[PDB]
């Protein structure tokens, strides 16, 4: 029977790019932990400004105060500088980020505050330094691990672009050599990595481009071993698109729901979306949508997966891969507030991208959020998160479209007695809706957010509200 | 005040090339420890014959029975296949050898039997996969570790021999990129590696080509930190030649005494040395020596270093780097027995190269000794080791040349009351010596080995003996 972690159904996730989050407020002995202070100046690399895991641990005050109870990262394992997606050693948190020691301290500091931590697993490819590929570059045909990868001919040309690489790399890039997952050895190796970190204490896995590993039975085994070590462990696939193939209950607990992000932005932002700023590969926040259109595709999205899994989906509006919220919408604040509102009132776990909560800009490849806040946008986030953690219906309640006409959208979230009405007016003019709400046994008349069985609801332009009771 | 480990002064060392020592007598789950047996056949690399650390642990019976009480290895850290001297990760025992787990079991099994273990430290250079060099190959000029190595210009050509590497490699080889030890960071990194394994439990360090690291103060610091973790830890430099520079008491406890090996072989083997089989870079077992000549250069070698250090020298007759004993002497058994005799009766710790003890051949680049023994040569070894562990004088006693004329050599080892006379007749004919031995207070007349104050000693051709009392 389909079962997903319960803590996830009630969590608020917060995606961090550690390299560019926060510096520690203290001089840190990263890498060379034994080095004495007198030598500090002699050591240029240690002495002299990127973000690290110390930093995040130090800013747990801020993160918790925002209302966050679970942070998940981009890839943090040892890898070359500015290339965290080209794994060198999966068993080691990168030295510059503070290594396993710094990670262990952050991990404990988080758990002490009851904040979960999920890591990114880049298992489709590694790097040219990854040990077993290293052995292949050194021994060629004689290397015993040739069959661990996808070699096409000899000789290989790892670094000289003037000659054919002769081995398959992600997106045709030599620095991203792919794994031969069909090989039961490669598979066993991936599984053992997954198990290790769960034993270490992480609260589960983000899966990078998991749809590339096509070996049948691969992800069910992944789920089996994973849950074996931690039955409450959260397995999220980063998949852009219909993810039914992996959401049958035997693989992931959910995916990063870009199917939610596209329509939500296309409706809240409308024709204000800055096209040259949309990572069209991930989501489609265009063409602009009218209330009735947002309503049908949203319901279509809500009946795509089993309800238990829908509740553990990772809803988002941005990621390391896309532009920030303020940027995708040409600085239109209302687009941010309206979008965030739909995000924090959607069934499934919400995910806030670090920086968005302070109105920080960001195109498709900026950081250090705690360094000019957009107070308004910040308050919208904190307040909405408090409200989501205050009413169970907003987390695991059902979802009912009440009204969707023109540019005005109304739906209700209900759990037992609790009934909440959420309204969105994406239009440039004030609007009112007359609705026959006989599906509700109460009459939500109290404003829990914003300003505003027969109901007459009037909303100001580009505004949303939450009605309680 | 100069002080070296005491256990070393009474140990008998046994040099092993793990890859080619012994296979485990059991199917082993190296690398993928979690893999289930049903998959064994699906895993070609695991299922299908090199030596490993399991194997050595299983053959501790044999090693201890030989009389060995300390084994030291060639490089065993993670590295490409057939290239153990090109380190990939210093913090990991190579997967194929059984990893840290297998090493941990061998380490404990040895210590339970009171047998020490010394590892080889290759700190002058690493490999192209070594993480920080990896970062340099990936980021070039922008890599933050450029100054960790010896880059000469851009761009670098790591694997394409048709273009200049542009970075310094050991002996001009690109696969062996050198470290910039002058960099206090590189140095701190080396030191931390050294400390780690000592904390792990190893009984000290063999230092590979340490004379290449010229940074002043480097080896004194190495000694300081090392002994800090384990005051009884054995620091041996692999240096071929006058090692006074490093044997002043602030650096090594001793070196692999090739200054002993050269003359010893040149005398015991004489013109039977097979020139095309001598690694002339390490030692010079030519031209052949007459007794009187062996005597003067041996005394010259015995007054080269402080006595406390001479007692912890690692005397040997062969290494991974040279030809085996049976091979260097054209299969002349007497050369082996005579040489081994001089080795086991010399002041300082003796080192036996695995295979030599069974007459195994070996040119300058064969293994698996426990697989046709030369019983005679084996008995000579075991017996001589038993005799060395039986009389303290043979270990830490003084050294006095009694007679050296023609092809007949006599010396005594004395400790307190104990006085031992060792005789060598390298000649092809029977010989007798008349000596005035007034330096001794006893008259050694008992044969403890071999067949034979005024003394008349007669020795058969190509033979040696030990006289007790």
UniProtKB/TrEMBL annotation, chains A, B:
<protein>
    <submittedName>
        <fullName>Alpha amylase, catalytic region</fullName>
        <ecNumber>3.2.1.54</ecNumber>
    </submittedName>
</protein>
<feature type="domain" description="Glycosyl hydrolase family 13 catalytic">
    <location>
        <begin position="15"/>
        <end position="388"/>
    </location>
</feature>
<dbReference type="GO" id="GO:0005975">
    <property type="term" value="P:carbohydrate metabolic process"/>
</dbReference>
<dbReference type="Pfam" id="PF00128">
    <property type="entry name" value="Alpha-amylase"/>
</dbReference>
<keyword id="KW-0326">Glycosidase</keyword>
<dbReference type="GO" id="GO:0047798">
    <property type="term" value="F:cyclomaltodextrinase activity"/>
</dbReference>
<dbReference type="Pfam" id="PF22026">
    <property type="entry name" value="Alpha-amylase_C_2"/>
</dbReference>
<keyword id="KW-0378">Hydrolase</keyword>
<dbReference type="InterPro" id="IPR006047">
    <property type="entry name" value="GH13_cat_dom"/>
</dbReference>
<dbReference type="InterPro" id="IPR054174">
    <property type="entry name" value="Alpha-amylase-like_C"/>
</dbReference>
<dbReference type="InterPro" id="IPR017853">
    <property type="entry name" value="GH"/>
</dbReference>
<dbReference type="InterPro" id="IPR013780">
    <property type="entry name" value="Glyco_hydro_b"/>
</dbReference>
């Amino acid at each position: 029977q389909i079962q997903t972690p319960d803590w996830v159904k009630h969590a608020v996730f917060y995606q961090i790019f550690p390299d560019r989050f926060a510096r520690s407020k203290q001089p840190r002995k990263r890498l060379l932990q034994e080095a004495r202070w007198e030598d500090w100046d002699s050591m240029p690399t240690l002495q002299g400004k990127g973000g690290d895991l110390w930093g995040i641990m130090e800013d747990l005050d801020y993160i918790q105060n925002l209302g966050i109870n679970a942070i998940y990262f981009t890839p943090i394992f040892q890898s070359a500088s500015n290339h965290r997606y080209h794994t060198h050693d999966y068993y080691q948190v990168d030295p510059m980020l503070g290594g396993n020691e710094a990670f262990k301290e952050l991990l404990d500091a988080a758990h002490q505050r009851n904040i979960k931590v999920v890591l990114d697993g880049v298992f489709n490819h590694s790097s040219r330094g990854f040990f077993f590929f290293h052995d292949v570059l050194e021994n060629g045909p004689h290397s015993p691990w040739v069959n661990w990868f996808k070699i096409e001919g000899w000789p290989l040309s790892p670094y000289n672009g003037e000659f054919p690489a002769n081995y398959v790399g992600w997106a045709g890039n030599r620095a991203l050599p792919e794994f031969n997952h069909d090989n039961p050895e490669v598979r066993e190796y991936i599984m053992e990595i997954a198990e290790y970190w769960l034993k270490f204490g992480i609260d589960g896995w983000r899966l990078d481009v998991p749809f590339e590993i096509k070996t049948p039975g691969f992800w069910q085994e992944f789920r089996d071993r994973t849950k074996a070590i931690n039955p409450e462990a959260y397995i999220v696939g980063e998949v852009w698109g219909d993810s039914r193939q992996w959401l049958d209950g035997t693989q992931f607990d959910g995916v990063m729901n870009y199917l939610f992000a596209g329509p939500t932005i296309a409706f809240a932002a409308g024709d204000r979306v800055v096209l040259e700023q949309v990572q069209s590969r991930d989501y489609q926040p265009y063409p602009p949508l009218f209330a009735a259109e947002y309503a049908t595709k949203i319901q279509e999205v809500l009946q795509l997966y089993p309800w238990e899994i829908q509740l553990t989906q990772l809803n988002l509006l941005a990621s390391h891969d896309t532009a920030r919220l303020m940027t995708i919408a040409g600085g239109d604040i209302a687009s941010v507030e309206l979008s965030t509102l739909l995000l924090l009132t959607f069934p499934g776990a919400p995910s806030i991208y670090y920086g968005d909560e302070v109105g920080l800009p960001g195109g498709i490849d900026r950081g250090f959020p705690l360094e000019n806040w957009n107070q308004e946008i910040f308050n919208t986030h904190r307040q909405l998160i408090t409200i989501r953690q205050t009413y169970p219906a907003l987390r695991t309640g059902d979802y009912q479209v009440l009204y969707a006409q023109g540019q005005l959208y109304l739906f209700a979230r209900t759990l037992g007695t609790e009934e909440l009405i959420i309204a969105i007016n994406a239009g440039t003019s004030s609007a009112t809706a007359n609705v026959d709400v006989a599906s509700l046994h109460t009459q939500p008349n109290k404003l829990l957010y914003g300003t505003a069985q027969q109901l007459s609801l009037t909303l100001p332009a580009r505004s949303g509200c939450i009605l309680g009771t």
